[PDB]
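Page header: ASSEMBLY MODEL / two components / 100 residues total.
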Amino acid sequence: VDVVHMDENSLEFDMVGIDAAIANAFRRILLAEVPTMAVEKVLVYNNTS
Amino acid sequence: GGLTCASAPQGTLRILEGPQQSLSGSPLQPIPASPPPQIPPGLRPRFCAFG
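Prediction written out in full:
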């Protein structure tokens, strides 16, 4: 793994010598399987907007 | 005051205003052609390939 550029909120690196079926697994776990926190329920009173 | 009749008139001159000369110009004046679109100046690759 050759890290090219890493700063806050970005990263660009290599992976030499890995086939597409593991690289796509890493890509597709970054997009849809690594979990986060996010707003689900909202409890309004006087949204007069 | 008898007002007798007379003979037949030979010709009838018709007086009328003349044709509108010097109204139209001798060359024609068309709407100019809308220009073909230009490639704008100052176009450069703003997208660099990532990593």
